[PDB]
Scaffold this active site. Structure first.
Site, mmCIF file in Angstrom:
data_model
loop_
_atom_site.group_PDB
_atom_site.id
_atom_site.type_symbol
_atom_site.label_atom_id
_atom_site.label_comp_id
_atom_site.label_asym_id
_atom_site.label_seq_id
_atom_site.Cartn_x
_atom_site.Cartn_y
_atom_site.Cartn_z
ATOM 1 N N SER A 1 0.900 -1.171 0.000
ATOM 2 C CA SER A 1 0.000 0.000 0.000
ATOM 3 C C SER A 1 0.895 1.164 0.000
ATOM 4 C CB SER A 1 -0.862 -0.029 1.320
ATOM 5 O OG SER A 1 -1.806 1.007 1.482
ATOM 6 N N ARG A 2 0.794 2.127 -0.988
ATOM 7 C CA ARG A 2 1.714 3.199 -1.158
ATOM 8 C C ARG A 2 1.503 4.356 -0.228
ATOM 9 N NH1 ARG A 2 -0.127 1.225 -5.430
ATOM 10 N NH2 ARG A 2 -1.494 3.010 -6.010
ATOM 11 N N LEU A 3 0.234 4.637 0.078
ATOM 12 C CA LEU A 3 -0.155 5.756 0.881
ATOM 13 C C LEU A 3 -0.130 5.481 2.430
ATOM 14 C CD1 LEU A 3 -3.285 7.083 -1.232
ATOM 15 C CD2 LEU A 3 -0.739 7.330 -1.599
ATOM 16 N N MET A 4 0.728 4.478 2.764
ATOM 17 C CA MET A 4 0.699 3.934 4.076
ATOM 18 C C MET A 4 1.133 4.891 5.122
ATOM 19 S SD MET A 4 2.440 0.332 5.493
ATOM 20 C CE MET A 4 3.464 0.250 3.934
#
Lengths: 593, 45, 457, 593, 129
Positions: free
Chosen positions: E121-124
């Site tokens: 998940s990039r927006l973590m």
């Protein structure tokens, strides 16, 4: 009535159609061939005619029957052989002197020649009745009444006239129903369109044992009553073989066999073999057949018969389930059914999806499986029934990613494999654990534990053994048997033994004999026992050679155990299996010190 | 069995790997056999 | 009427609507030559014909059409053996004429009466690898899977010629009581091939034994598809009317399949997997359905189709489809051929699922089936060991593996190695097979029932 | 006659085209470009125009030639460079100042400037004469058989006018034939459509070889006239060499060279080289070119000519077969003829099959192979002639698993495996005994045994020896050569001489690449006698080192065998081999004892 | 989803909507448009398959003025067992990461059998509390 406008391939276009339902049955031409209305373009309706056309003229007559392609559900389905377009095959042999369907025959749906004995129900005059109720019953078999006469669904009223006990024919009236005057008379058979599933009271949880009687399924991944199953494989897969075993052993009260486009010799074999062989719960005259009805169709026989096979059969199954019977339906193969569609999409000129098979494939398979399951029967008496579907498919050259196999796998909850390499050594059917799963495995073990066996505990170790065996085998190949540890040698041997003794159903004298869950359990106690004691032994210092030569006799015995008939002390625990347990114990001890 | 989309990227580099690795293993065997002949003669002496 | 246009093998006729499906029409060229075709599609005031013969030279209003007003049926007689015919419903070889006592349709259901009772009588090829490992029956369908480096014609002829000498030895045994007939049909193969076959049949016996349908590659694809249909009519009559067992040798089956492929390319019909038709299933079926015992149950049609695989793959559509349908698989191997084995039949994937129907027991042993399974199993292990011998060396392989490597070598070189005219009886083959089993010990032969191993060793 | 409806690409459709056949030659526009009607929809004919349809407005006239596109068969073929639909390239060089033919330039197929001397046959006026009977002949060659003029196939009648001896032009009439009024006039050539096979008295299987004059072809697996053969491609760094050498060394009566769709470097090389090189049998007048008739297409030439290329060549070959001659059709490459089909399909809109290649491909190859073969030539006193097709099939996907290669090998009975590494080092030809096969072996070996050679014994033994050598070489790598017997070492020693002398021949020398079929047999004799004797002698007490010193002179001779002349008294019996045999027997008593 | 928008926005509910099985949605897209003017894209799956998807993703997200939210967990079944196939491929571009399951763990017997290597998940870092 209508007049043929065009015949382009098996596709016929006829003008002067003001109506017609979907998939309406017609008799086309003076020949009176099978057809169905797929589509309508203008006034001209495109009707596919699916019985071979080599001589139909343009401007030949078109007769609408006025209702869709349908099936009769009524008395004399058992020990009576039919096609997928519900023509009795026996009736054809006599009249026509054409054992198979010739081009241009019109033979009615049932046998209107065999009188049947009708007895009246718990519903007498002045009593309300509703679809799926037991209005009466018909003696068909030597042991049981097969066909429970149901009022059809979508009919209702109070019975003004109940016919008395006696013999009647099928077309004679036997029931009169009151609701807005004479709603109609009813006859012994009732009709239903096969594109409509039959309605149930409720569907019920699937968690009750389905004994198919084959060691290899019971051991690895059993099915459930209410089950859905996919099985792949390609010739030498033993699918015909497992059908025959399946019919003989099956605890279900009806088995419905569906031939989707078969060799013909394969159909000729199974037909002969049911009355030649005896049943396991007994059977008086045509023993196995008494429980078996065949829908059989060959590879060039009508494309309608082949396409309708799964729907004609599922409708039969639902009717037996509404009667209160447990049904095991075997269809073989859905892949041959899939070819009927590939052909349909080209002819019509509709655009297909991948591999030249249409996109509507996915919906049509799914609809068939959802009508299966375990349910509480529709009708006032209330019973419990199941339709457990075992559906065969075939890979396209070892490619399991072909649309048909992937689609069926989408819908199924149980997957049972088929490995080519293992069939060559003769182990078909060949189920491992990396090509197969069952969601029912978890609940199913809980139910078997109860009945007597230790199965869940043995099932876990059994799964592990196979899973490690594969990985360990890859090291033997590449590195050699010089990188192994001694415990890993043990896993290799026990595994080879499992491969042979469950998966193989091939003879050496006689094709293997009925093995229950109880039998299957004993085999598992002896293999699992061998493995534990041997690894202890090597761990604790001991020769490999000493241990393998010593097990010896015990190994010959388990191999051949299945050929011997069940019960040899009991079904439960055989004396032959009981004694090995002692032998292992005696060996373990000699070895240790 | 296997993906029908972009197995070509992983498989292509494997194939090359294999033939390249094979050639190289042959040189390592050739060196090992090269020395082996020599020591067998020296050891008897 | 007159030709409207022509687009490839399809011919556009502008006509009138009285014609029926597959009604013969004859195209009159301006040369005054007539060629035959049958309407594939009919519509109002027009037709699409596929012409059997030719595909070019077809005009407009200088050309004419004439209707025969009989949809195609084949003129079948029972005096067909010895007689030379061409694959076109008549001889264009100037061979003895066909005659008719029935004309029978090739649609795939004329009056078709087949198996309600499966094959139980054994029919031998005189070749051990065929007979023992797979077995052949009075309805059995077995595909010869061949290659572009194997000589397909030599094996095709080999199986047929040796099965004619064995088959009367079997008649005396009371496996049979009726005639044997061969129906040989060659469709769209080279001249070189055609000549060869005729020469082979003559040497072994005669050409009185067989009936010949000859079709030349220069003749169209449309001709090629009708060629097996002609063979089917021949065989069904002989079985039905005169209670003869008919043996059909159908070469080349692949030739027929490519033809199907051409009438979807130069048609607007969208093809399925790998450019092979979607309705390819039905075309192939037609040949295979018309097999088994024929009514009276002393007549039969037994099939040996001959497939040559072009890529030699088992992912190609032709070998796959054929295999599901047919009652057995016989795989012939290039590697055996190279090594010097004749016949060079590899039994590693040769399998029959209808193994019981295939074997005999009333004119063959009951032990025949039991030994074959064990042999196959022991061959397979011997192949797993062969790969392992190359890798691992003999520096870790086991005592048990060593027996299996020896068995493999003895098995190729003795069992599968037979003279060009040397025929083996099925009973003698058992004795040979027992020699092969005899080197393994009583603990390695553990899978087999104790009764059989103590009886025969 | 017709009027142009559309020009969409090089495809032009025309209306008002009636009695338009489906192979009809038509000339489009005022310019008179060549075109041919592939298809017809209605009143409109769909034409592929092979030349640029630039400047062609809609409304230009279309003039029928009134007959299909045909090729001319008659005097003045040899020593001419042609198009794929037979148009003299040489004649354009004279007129146009162009190598190639540019758009709006057509010319007749045979030159009309050239006159040939017509000699009557054995038939005179009033005689009935039949299809193919020899009506006369033309002599214009002295090195080979010339152009014997036949009465046109499928044509019969009584001859009204037989022109007497004298020079006539090719154009000019020399025959009028009476068959239902005046049948027509005929000329010195005949026209024949090339997409129709030419008849012959009957076709036979091949059995009859001829001088190939390349040792490796005869020795490894014999080369036959009337054969079907696949040779691998290389794209002119290996392909060119073997083709040039096969044309030059083979003293077959004619050779017909077809370049289907080549680089243009290869076309350029074959035309300049043919007069330059010397016959291998004697004679001048542009040696090899006088025996040669060339169809030479680079890929740049129109696509219909590339597709047509082989068909025209095959008709040419077939024409000479009725004269009674042995022909080599050397075609290079079918992959390039196939490429044309693919192009022509996409232009029409035809849907192909696999890898973009049509489905017309497999049937067109089967039809093509059968035109080639051996036949008893048509014409009244009968002769035998042959047409042998060696077709290269190159990469068409970068592999040989593509549809063109895989299809051909199957119909083909012969494969000869060129070796790349040896080819890059410029040994031509250098055929690998591993990949190669001939199914012609059996019938042929029996043919040479008849004629005088010990051929079956020697050829079979040649193969076994080499196969065996790979397997023994592996034992030398892993175990060592010192622990192996003298016998095994010998098996290898002999294989190396068989490899050096035959297989590694250099087609840049004629005392190393030209020797007659007997000469090639005598060399091979020499090596086999030595192998047996060498194994015999080491058994009776000799060593590898001892053996080598002792054989000496005979071993040196066999090594030097290729350098020797094609004659020594005869070119069929080489006296030096026959006497060598004696020196070997005398040497074997000495060496052994 | 329309029902989720009512609860989230009018009465300020946190809605977790589970939408199973996206494979059945995707299949439906293919079967329709075999008789309209619109004509499917890559491998017989619509080129406008993306538009369909996006209509489902439209009614998901945070809501203005911070009355409630709708959070959505769709279930996709990979039918060929590759993520290079259309159903995972188009969907994955829209979605903020992915959690991909594991075939191998399952066989062993593990539950839940997912793996962490293909899951990201990039927006973590920015998202979390």
């Amino acid at each position: 009535y209508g007049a043929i406008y065009s015949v382009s391939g098996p596709v016929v276009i006829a003008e002067n159609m003001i109506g017609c339902a979907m998939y309406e049955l017609v008799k086309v031409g003076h020949d009176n061939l099978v057809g169905e209305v797929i589509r309508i373009d203008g006034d001209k309706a495109t009707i596919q005619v699916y019985e071979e056309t080599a001589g139909l003229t343009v401007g030949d007559p078109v007769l609408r029957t006025g209702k869709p392609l349908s099936v009769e559900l009524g008395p004399g389905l058992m020990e009576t052989i039919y096609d997928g377009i519900q023509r009795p095959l026996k009736a054809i042999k006599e009249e026509s002197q054409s054992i198979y369907i010739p081009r241009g025959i019109d033979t009615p749906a049932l046998d209107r020649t065999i009188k049947w004995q009708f007895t009246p129900g718990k519903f007498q005059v002045g009593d309300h009745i509703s679809g799926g109720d037991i209005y009466g019953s018909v003696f068909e078999n030597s042991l049981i009444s097969s066909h429970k006469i149901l009022l059809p669904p979508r009919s209702r009223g109070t019975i003004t006239w109940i016919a008395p006990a006696g013999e009647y024919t099928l077309d004679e009236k036997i029931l009169e129903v009151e609701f807005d005057g004479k709603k109609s008379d009813f006859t012994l058979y009732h009709t239903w369109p096969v594109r409509v599933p039959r309605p149930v009271t409720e569907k019920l949880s699937a968690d009750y044992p389905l004994l198919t009687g084959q060691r290899v399924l019971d051991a690895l991944f059993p099915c459930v009553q209410g089950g859905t199953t996919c099985i792949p494989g390609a010739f030498g897969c033993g699918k015909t073989v497992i059908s025959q075993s399946l019919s003989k052993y099956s605890n279900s009260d009806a088995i419905i066999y569906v031939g989707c486009g078969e060799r013909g010799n394969e159909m000729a074999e199974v037909l002969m073999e049911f009355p030649e062989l005896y049943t396991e719960m007994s059977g008086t005259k045509e023993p196995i057949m008494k429980r078996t009805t065949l829908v059989a169709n060959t590879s060039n026989m009508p494309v309608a018969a082949r396409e309708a096979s799964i729907y004609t059969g599922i409708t039969l199954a639902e009717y037996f389930r509404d009667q209160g019977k447990n049904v095991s339906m075997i269809a073989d193969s859905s892949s041959r059914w899939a070819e009927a569609l590939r052909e349909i999409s080209g002819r019509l000129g509709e655009m297909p999806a991948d591999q030249g098979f249409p996109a509507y494939l996915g919906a049509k398979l799914a609809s068939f499986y959802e009508r299966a399951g375990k349910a509480v029967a529709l009708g006032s008496p209330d019973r419990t029934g199941s339709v457990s579907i075992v559906a065969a498919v075939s890979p396209a050259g070892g490619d399991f990613s072909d649309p048909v196999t992937t689609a069926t796998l989408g819908i199924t909850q149980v997957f049972w494999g088929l490995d080519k390499k293992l069939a060559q050594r003769k182990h078909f059917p060949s189920i491992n654990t990396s090509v197969s799963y069952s969601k029912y495995t978890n609940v199913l073990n809980k139910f078997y534990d109860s009945n007597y066996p230790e199965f869940p505990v043995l099932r876990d170790r059994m799964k592990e053994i196979l899973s490690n065996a594969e990985e360990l085998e890859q090291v033997v190949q590449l590195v050699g048997k010089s990188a192994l540890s001694d415990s890993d040698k043990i896993t290799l041997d026990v595994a080879t033994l499992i491969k042979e003794d469950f998966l193989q159903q091939n003879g050496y004298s006689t094709y293997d004999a009925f093995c229950p869950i109880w039998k299957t359990f004993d085999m598992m106690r002896a293999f699992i026992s061998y493995h534990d004691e041997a690894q202890k032994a090597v761990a604790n210092g001991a020769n490999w050679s000493k241990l393998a030569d010593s097990t010896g006799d015990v190994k010959h015995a388990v191999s051949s155990s299945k050929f011997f008939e069940p019960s040899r002390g009991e079904k439960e625990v055989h004396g032959e299996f009981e004694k090995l347990l002692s032998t292992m114990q005696e060996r373990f001890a000699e070895s240790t010190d | 069995v296997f993906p029908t989309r972009m197995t070509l990227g992983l498989m292509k580099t494997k194939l090359k790997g294999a033939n390249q690795g094979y050639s190289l293993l042959k040189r390592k065997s050739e060196a090992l056999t090269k020395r082996f002949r020599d020591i067998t003669k020296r050891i008897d002496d | 009427n007159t030709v409207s246009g022509v687009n490839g093998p399809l011919v556009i006729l502008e006509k009138v609507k009285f014609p029926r499906y597959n009604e013969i029409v004859n195209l009159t060229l301006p040369d005054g030559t007539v060629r035959q075709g049958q309407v594939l599609e009919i519509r109002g005031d027009r037709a699409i014909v596929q012409v059997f013969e030719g595909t070019s030279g077809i005009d407009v209003k200088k050309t004419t059409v004439e209707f025969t007003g009989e949809s195609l049926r084949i003129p079948v007689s029972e005096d067909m053996l010895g007689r030379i015919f061409d694959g076109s419903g008549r001889p264009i070889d100037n061979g003895p004429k066909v005659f008719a006592e029935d004309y029978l349709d090739i649609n795939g259901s004329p009056i078709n009466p087949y198996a309600r009772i499966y094959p139980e009588e054994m029919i031998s090829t005189g070749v051990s690898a065929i007979d023992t490992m797979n077995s052949i029956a009075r309805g059995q369908k077995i595909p010869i899977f061949s290659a572009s480096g194997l000589p397909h014609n030599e094996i095709a002829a080999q199986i047929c010629r040796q099965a004619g000498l064995v088959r009367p030895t079997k008649d005396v045994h009371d496996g049979h009581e009726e005639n044997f007939s061969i129906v040989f049909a060659a469709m769209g193969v080279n001249l070189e091939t055609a000549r060869f076959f005729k020469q082979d049949f003559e040497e072994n016996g005669s050409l009185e034994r067989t009936s010949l349908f000859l079709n030349l590659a220069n003749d169209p694809t449309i001709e090629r598809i009708i060629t097996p249909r002609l063979a089917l009519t021949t065989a069904e009559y002989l079985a039905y009317q005169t209670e003869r067992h008919v043996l059909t040798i159908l070469t080349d089956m692949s030739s027929y399949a490519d033809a199907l492929r051409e009438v979807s390319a130069a048609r607007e019909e969208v093809p399925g997997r790998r450019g092979y038709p979607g309705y390819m299933y039905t075309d192939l079926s037609t040949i295979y359905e018309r097999a088994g015992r024929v009514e009276g149950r002393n007549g039969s049609i037994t099939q040996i189709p001959i497939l040559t695989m072009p890529n030699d793959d088992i992912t190609h559509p032709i070998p796959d489809l054929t295999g599901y349908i047919t009652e057995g698989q016989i795989f012939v191997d290039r590697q055996l051929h190279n090594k010097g084995i004749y016949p060079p039949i590899n039994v590693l994937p040769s399998l029959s699922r209808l193994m019981k129907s295939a074997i005999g027991e009333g004119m063959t042993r009951k032990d025949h089936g039991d030994v074959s399974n064990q042999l196959y199993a022991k061959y397979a292990i011997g192949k797993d060991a062969a790969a392992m011998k190359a890798v691992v060396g003999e520096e870790a392989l086991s005592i048990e593996d060593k027996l299996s490597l020896e068995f493999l070598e003895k098995f190729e070189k003795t069992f599968i190695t037979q003279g060009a005219y040397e025929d083996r009886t099925v009973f003698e083959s058992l004795d040979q097979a027992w020699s092969l089993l005899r080197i393994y010990p009583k603990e390695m032969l553990n899978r087999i029932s104790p009764k059989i191993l103590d009886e025969f060793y």
